[PDB]
Write a protein that binds this ligand. Structure first.
Ligand SMILES: Cc1cc2nc3c(=O)[nH]c(=O)nc-3n(C[C@H](O)[C@H](O)[C@H](O)COP(=O)(O)OP(=O)(O)OC[C@H]3O[C@@H](n4cnc5c(N)ncnc54)[C@H](O)[C@@H]3O)c2cc1C
Ligand SMILES: Cc1cc2nc3c(=O)[nH]c(=O)nc-3n(C[C@H](O)[C@H](O)[C@H](O)COP(=O)(O)OP(=O)(O)OC[C@H]3O[C@@H](n4cnc5c(N)ncnc54)[C@H](O)[C@@H]3O)c2cc1C
Ligand SMILES: CN1CCN(C(=O)Nc2ccc(F)cc2)CC1
Ligand SMILES: [Br-]
Ligand SMILES: [Mg+2]
Ligand SMILES: [Mg+2]
Lengths: 483, 486
């Protein structure tokens, strides 16, 4: 069969691209994915990683984890109930999450039936030649051919995959993929990694752990959440600890063995040991290029294994494009979606558009959560002669009553002090992901600190902190911090 | 006894002006208020209405109220506990709120003592003459003079006060003032009014009511929350009804009598009756101008009763200014604050600045809450030839799981369709007040709909809805609503 566009991976980017090509530019479109619904054995499926084993289910499970805090905090506002009756039923959470994800799976199924010129093929897509995608039974290129799809244009949109360290006993460890399908909540869990996935799952496991349970998070470096604002990294460390999570920094697993009872015996590089029920490896995600047989067409890969792309998502082979995590730039669903739209607008619209990977608002669904947009100060301080930092950090009033006095809201604005232009906004606290979205719009409009502090506050809110900062807390002058 | 600035009312507006003048321009400032800490008899005190009997305590109490929904909603996420053991202890909430408000009262006391040239005076401020404020012991102009303050400049910042309809048995009724100090949560309560205070208090009472309790909100017209987006007004009405609140529209108390058991027999103009333990009037607030003796120096009031001001907060009388609720415009703490900061930068900083009363973000801590900034579509449609409305209304996935399927999230953007300029943004749902703040900055930057839709979403959030809307849902053309443009 012959298509204007064949999309390998029915994920965030691949579905946006395919749908836009078909419906907006009236192209005939094929899309390939390995599974029609969520879970084992391939985890990602129709909808992509976000829908199946990413943003969507994880946000539901963090929402669930948040009730641990709400139930406790309710008491400061006069709520009374039998604390000893309280159970976190993980099986119910997983069932609710599964129905939500399956409902999305099914609606995508329906979208493919009801959308003329948009066809779904099940199985493993790879490049036979520069105008032919072969769909096969398995990831093994010797497996049976299901389809051969003639393609004017080929979009690689296979996303990323958990990185597992080659340590002895790696097979006794899981990734985020398996974490979504644990039948029981682990009593003892080690999350390995200081990134958003380790931290978000550490919060999930901490809420649902059975009595006398314990969540440990380990990270090879000194401070979790590298890439985030340093004040936020320190505070989220403190606030995780105050909710009973053990943060082991400068620690990394050397090997894993099974204890006699089938629990995992963890030996850290430091020699230290830890017995846990689950070891969840969240140390990175790598582009999924192994199965695509890109050697058949000579698409240039980076040493990392990402598809190399120009700003317009073009590979070195004309008619073959890559978007989303496979490009190993910003691994976020809205960026993949944005890349997908910009490509189809370029290729089929002659409306040439590149995704701006700068000033992308993002969140961490930690407890409490992070919202951030633009540059952290250390980065700004190398690219700008004078940087101002406006900082507000305090326990909001409601958390003095709640009893969570450790829950400092952090609001930080980083500016080019020469003209007041906002380079970065960094939030930690309840609502931070919701606050930061319209901040993304501000930074796209080249907002200055004066545009923030001349806006009238909404009171009482956490967000009004952003519009109450007149005076820098400190500066960077030629990379050097000054009071 | 001589001061650069005398401020009457140590409230949101008065303290901002007072503090700025003293600390920014080394000016010498007297601030007058009738009370140093919250509660009876005068309710407002040092800090003002917001701190003592307004935004601050209200928000704590709405936060308390929200736990009724969290406790129920937790079950969909697998939380289990003895539902029959759940009690809402109103007395605990009020004691916690009182301690929090008292600490702020004490925080302001420390501010005055620490700050050179910033002095507090206890008592009632009135105008003797153009340049003299007299502090008396009571609101009576005849009570003893505690002080005579010479003023190069006088600021009137005495705020507003609940209006109590002059109906038989109004003395059986309370205002928001008394609601903050009820010793027990009412089993049955009638909140009178369709504005934010009646709506917010209905939410609070609804969560804290003892068993067999019932919250009734009455409004004299057809649809609550006049001046908010019509879709949001209809949705809040449904979402409050879905949570057990009874909304009586086109209904208004004609009188109240005490039953022999201490309860209130309410008779509506319609002839309907209702027995409740509490009647809270929240039908309006009116500027506090009486006790200032404005008639002594001829400060002009408006046909509505508020102090007439120009864009610079100036009265007809030179050296006499008025900010905040006494001007009877937007009764919001951050506007009062902005006006005070602007006045002091104009008069003392030689940096004339006028408050922008357009594109002001605000909220209603309804459950769930409203966040809004700029024009509703009906108002835009009268000013602009072509208005586009972008609308997304849906139950978020988490509220399908929580069991609160009635919690439709509403996100509406109103534009000038001739250039895409965003004229107003209207949100209903969890987080709306937080989402809307940075939208206020967007509107100050003259953001177009394309500035929103070209910004990359934060996923998953409610807020990303605002960056997902490219196609108008409908339009006004020369004031006429229609699906499609001609
Ligand atoms: C635990 C976790 C949480 C996350 N949380 C967030 C978040 O909160 N917000 C956010 O913005 N991002 C989040 N992300 C990132 C987000 O999921 C990704 O950035 C996004 O899904 C990538 O989109 P994509 O189009 O690149 O690929 P994907 O959405 O991963 O889609 C790739 C698809 O290709 C399929 N596939 C792979 N190989 C083949 C093949 N050979 N043939 C056919 N099909 C194939 C896969 O089955 C999959 O469906 C999260 C990721 C994870 C793992
Ligand atoms: C229940 C309620 C909830 C509210 N919620 C919010 C909200 O969530 N967000 C928001 O932005 N706004 C809210 N408001 C409005 C907010 O409280 C006001 O807009 C704001 O306080 C007005 O500030 P001001 O400077 O005009 O005066 P105020 O803050 O009202 O200060 C006036 C002060 O003057 C004193 N005073 C009066 N007469 C005299 C006199 N003769 N001599 C000396 N002192 C005198 C009073 O004691 C008082 O302290 C709410 C109001 C109420 C009643
Ligand atoms: C871009 N938005 C995303 C959210 N959204 C929506 O409707 N979500 C949804 C809720 C519940 C459910 F069951 C399925 C989807 C509106 C459009
Ligand atoms: Br580090
Ligand atoms: Mg089809
Ligand atoms: Mg002093």
């Amino acid at each position: 069969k012959a298509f204007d566009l064949v999309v390998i991976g029915a994920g965030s980017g691949g579905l946006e691209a395919g749908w836009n090509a078909a419906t907006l530019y009236g192209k005939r479109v094929a899309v390939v994915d390995v599974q029609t619904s969520h879970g084992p054995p391939f985890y990602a499926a129709l909808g992509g990683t976000c829908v199946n084993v990413g943003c969507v289910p994880k946000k539901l499970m963090v929402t669930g984890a948040q009730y641990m805090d709400h139930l406790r905090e309710s008491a400061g506002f006069g709520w009374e109930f039998d604390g000893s009756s309280v159970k976190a039923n993980w099986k119910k959470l997983i069932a609710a999450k599964n129905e939500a994800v399956l409902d999305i799976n099914k609606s995508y199924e329906g979208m493919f039936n009801d959308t003329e010129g948009l066809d779904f093929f099940l199985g493993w897509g790879s490049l036979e030649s520069k105008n032919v995608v072969v769909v096969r039974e398995t990831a093994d290129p010797k497996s049976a051919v299901k389809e051969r799809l003639q393609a004017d244009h080929i979009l690689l949109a296979t996303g990323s995959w958990p990185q597992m360290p080659a340590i002895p006993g790696i097979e006794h460890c899981i990734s985020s993929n398996e974490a979504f399908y644990l039948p029981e909540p682990p009593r003892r869990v080690l999350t390995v990694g200081g990134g958003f996935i380790s931290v978000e799952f550490a919060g999930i496991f901490n809420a649902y752990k059975p009595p006398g349970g314990k969540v440990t998070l380990c990270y090879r470096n000194n401070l979790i959440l590298r890439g985030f604002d340093e004040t936020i990294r320190e505070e989220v460390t403190k606030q995780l600890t105050a909710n009973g999570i053990e943060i082991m920094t400068n620690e990394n697993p050397a090997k894993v063995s099974l204890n006699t009872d089938g629990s995992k015996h963890v030996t850290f590089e430091s020699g230290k040991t830890l017995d846990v029920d689950v070891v969840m490896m969240a140390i990175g995600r790598i582009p999924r290029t192994n199965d695509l047989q890109l050697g058949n067409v000579g698409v240039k890969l980076t040493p990392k294994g990402g598809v190399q792309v120009d700003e317009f998502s073009r590979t070195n082979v004309p008619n073959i494009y890559a978007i989303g995590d496979i490009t190993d730039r910003l691994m976020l669903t809205p960026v993949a979606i944005n890349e997908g739209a910009a490509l189809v607008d370029t290729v089929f619209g002659n409306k040439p558009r590149k995704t701006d990977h700068t000033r992308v608002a993002s969140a961490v669904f930690s407890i409490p959560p992070i919202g951030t947009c633009g540059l952290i100060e250390e980065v700004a301080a190398k690219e700008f002669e004078k940087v101002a930092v406006y900082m507000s950090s305090f326990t909001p009033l409601m958390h003095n009553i709640s009893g969570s006095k450790y829950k400092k809201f952090v609001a930080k604005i980083v500016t080019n002090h020469s003209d007041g232009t906002v380079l970065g906004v960094h939030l930690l606290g309840d609502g931070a992901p919701e606050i930061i979205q319209a901040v993304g719009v501000c930074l796209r409009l080249n907002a200055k600190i004066s545009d923030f502090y001349n806006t009238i506050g909404v009171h009482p809110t956490s967000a009004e902190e952003l519009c109450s900062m007149r005076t820098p807390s400190y500066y960077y002058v030629k990379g050097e911090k000054m009071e």
